[PDB]
Amino acid sequence: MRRIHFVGIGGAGMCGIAEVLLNLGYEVSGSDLKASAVTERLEKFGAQIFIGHQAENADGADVLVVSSARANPEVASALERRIPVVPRAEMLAELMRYRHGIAVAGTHGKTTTTSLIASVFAAGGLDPTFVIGGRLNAAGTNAQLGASRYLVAEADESDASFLHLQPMVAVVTNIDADHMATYGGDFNKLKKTFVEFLHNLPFYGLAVMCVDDPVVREILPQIARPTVTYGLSEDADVRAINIRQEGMRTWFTVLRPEREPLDVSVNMPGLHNVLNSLATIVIATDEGISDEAIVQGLSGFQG
């Protein structure tokens, strides 16, 4: 397959995916009801844009991507012609197969942790593409989305594509019951899904686990993958101690195996943001990012 066709390519969750696929070297086409600066930018980058929906817009497409949600003549034409029609969320999840993917999973804290990771990686000069709220970003980037080696993405356990993400590194911030309905209303089935998620890591991958959560601590011995734990717990690999405040800024000292203690600060209050920073610190440490870029990335994040 070489040509991907987006139905509604100007949508806020669609244009970013099309831009990465252009960056990856694919032929990209898309239709929309109105030309916009979004479709003009995509066209400048090589996308073929159709205004209006008609069956012929899907001619030649190898796969269709359709908006979160079917009588549409492009879709109907693709089905009758046995062209696969994939939902937006699946194509988004698939982008991780082309990059060094960092999946930020857990029921709470994904958005902040993803942003903190992006901020530290940016401070180290790596310009990562990142996914928050289903939207691809690259902060102040001067390039097509997806240009960086790194893709940092929220992994939502309620998303149909959860068990199809192929990350190199995965965080589990915590395991709550918000999305029990996704798994038959059974919290134990939800827990097993996190184990299966972590087993999509390759044996050389890394699982970053918050052991302050008793549910994470419970599934920890089932993860037959390399693991680094973090939290305030005395037995966490990467720990925060001596937590203090100076204004709206929280300071703490981070302990890491075989490293000197490092003082960091973060511009947001609450232990949950200390934990989000610890997760970030584990990932940046494992990736080899300097202490200065870590301090700069955490300290400069607004919110």
Add this chain to the structure above:
Amino acid sequence: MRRIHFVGIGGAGMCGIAEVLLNLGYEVSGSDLKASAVTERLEKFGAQIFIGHQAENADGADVLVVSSARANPEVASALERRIPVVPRAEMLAELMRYRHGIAVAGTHGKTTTTSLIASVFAAGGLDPTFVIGGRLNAAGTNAQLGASRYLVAEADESDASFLHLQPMVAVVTNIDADHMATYGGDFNKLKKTFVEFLHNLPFYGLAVMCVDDPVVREILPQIARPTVTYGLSEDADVRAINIRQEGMRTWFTVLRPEREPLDVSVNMPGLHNVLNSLATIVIATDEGISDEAIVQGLSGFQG
């Protein structure tokens, strides 16, 4: 992770995996009770071999691989130091991430279809590594296992690693009830697992589906991946007609989209071996392999 340690590296299912990891560039060590030509070959290829089991043999290992079978001192030492221990079957499934993987799934016909695929690819000069019965082979190869771009492997729905295979192409020969116990004794759960398996294909991947099976035909509209169907069914993409016998040899004409009809023969009787050949023909055609190599591989496979 860089050093993989095999406990019982001389085993028939272990030595092949160790050889591929050596071919992939990893540090490989392994212990065994007896030195043999198998451990000498692994040592010639760069493995570090220990005879006898003692805890120190696992020093420095980043991951342990243990036989489909825990009091062992190397295992106990690895657990105490939080080194992941993965079963033989899981490391085997993981090899597909490094290669152009062809997963031959289905309840019946996996062994023959894999062998025919290997035989056709071999005839085209591609020397594939292939997995039948959990043993890695490359036929008459003059090289380390895994040297080819291609890895062709049986994908068994009863294997715990089934949903962790990451193939480029997947066959489903048929869906039977043999392994219902793996899925709570529920055939409908078993069917859903084949759908989830096919969704591990990337959007550019290929699903090769035998539509003569009513169960395969049922799940076909759920496969949101590129698909080629085969069988004797009049509506299959790739079909066999004019089936005849001349000795113990079965002849038939294969019809393929946008190709002229091609006469082939196979040295085994029964419509099930026609179907095994059709699956092979679909995969070889999609890979660009010549008619000559297809004819030669199929006719030259003994049994």
Add this chain to the structure above:
Amino acid sequence: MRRIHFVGIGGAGMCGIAEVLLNLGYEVSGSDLKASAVTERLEKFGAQIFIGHQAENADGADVLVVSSARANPEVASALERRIPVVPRAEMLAELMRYRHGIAVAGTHGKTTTTSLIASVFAAGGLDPTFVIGGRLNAAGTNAQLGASRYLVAEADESDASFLHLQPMVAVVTNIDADHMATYGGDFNKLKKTFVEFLHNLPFYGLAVMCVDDPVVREILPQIARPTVTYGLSEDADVRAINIRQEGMRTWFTVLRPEREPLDVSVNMPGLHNVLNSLATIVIATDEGISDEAIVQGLSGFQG
């Protein structure tokens, strides 16, 4: 080789090379007489910085890079231990082996053509790294130098590394006599060097030749590589017609094989800048860049 050591890493021509090697994944160290924001940025990205020159700074280095120009104790230590010491210009030329290299050669017009190419590639979202005056740039980049797939570099026939560049695409704007002394004061030897330079392209490479120059036209039949010619000559593949001025802006229509005529403008006068733009248009066209990015890149270049 894994550790590269720069003697005088803070210099304006050294820091850029060190940053790209960091981006490529190498261990990079460097010494300098004074810490500066340049060395602090390099340290943030993973460089090990030494202040002051002492023999031990070179310990562990696999290669040393020294500034354009031996009594230095780091150099002397490396020579005594048979570590290679490569000049800045050679390490710079070597960066092209890791990227899609575009070598802008010719006696005149290298700086402007390199800048125009970078500007058009930037407009297409490709954020190229480019080398003008021996200095690596990525204009308004949010990343380490070298992050882009593309490296656009002046290729100076007076540089000792000229015949060691390994580009994917090479321009020859013109062949003048400025640097005859490099070649024994013999213009015919200088012409032969341009032929040998173009033969460092791979057979899949591209030579972009300005046939308005009679010297380029002379060596053209000797280039056994894919070639696209440009200029005002009636027989050029890519030509400029209908040249006009409106202010300090020059307008013209570009003819390209199998394309519709395209109107462009450039914010600098003179036929030499029409030619610089034609070279840029040939490279952008062959790389697949849209007409809109070409028009925007050329029109937005100040000077």
Add this chain to the structure above:
Amino acid sequence: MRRIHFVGIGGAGMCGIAEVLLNLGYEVSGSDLKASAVTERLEKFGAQIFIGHQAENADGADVLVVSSARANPEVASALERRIPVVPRAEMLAELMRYRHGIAVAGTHGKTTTTSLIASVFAAGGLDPTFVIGGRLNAAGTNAQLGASRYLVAEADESDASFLHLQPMVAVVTNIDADHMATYGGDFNKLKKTFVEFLHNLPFYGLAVMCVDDPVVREILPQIARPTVTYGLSEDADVRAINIRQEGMRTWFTVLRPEREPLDVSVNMPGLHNVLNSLATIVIATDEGISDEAIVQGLSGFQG
């Protein structure tokens, strides 16, 4: 460029090159006066074969390869259409760009040293493709030529493509005056060409230098590339001592930096074959090949 057309593809020096290009994924066509088993094998592997020479055989070709030397209508058609026509030897030299290239240079000993290297790499399971006498081989291979990661080739200083080889590792066995005519009949110009040859290595490359030759010893300080020296000289990095005979077999002890002494034997007499063996040992050691494979590769080479 994607389609390469061979004029005389069945010739002994052409078919091997076409097979590697097929293995690399290119479209390959070729013409010849007679069908043979050689053209049938190429056709089985995906080559398009034309019988007879007519201009139309060159249609669609991006480059033509012609045997070791124009009235041919395919050549004339290509020249008239500005399709590059490259000689067999230049395309052969270019294959090294796709592989881990080992260039065996020096006036004497190239054929034996190449065969010994290939023999040792084969014993280590690497099935290398190698070039002796302008012919591509892979010994008893079950695969297309070029399938291995490694390409081992004689580098002849009289070959027009000498300074266009892009090896990762280069041997210089000795520098004699046989080919002074290639270099204006000036031995000093010949010496300088070997220096330029070694500078085509990248800074991470390796030069393997026989310092028993005083000419090699003379140019050694000009090689600003990683270097390992070998020979009987007391100051060589890798040395042979205790040379003895047992039958028609020559035994000696090889000393290597930071390794225990290793006894090896070879089936051919003369110090020149000790030197050919030392060169092989340097390359195999640097590539990480086990002592067992070295001993087996050297001991099993017939002659």
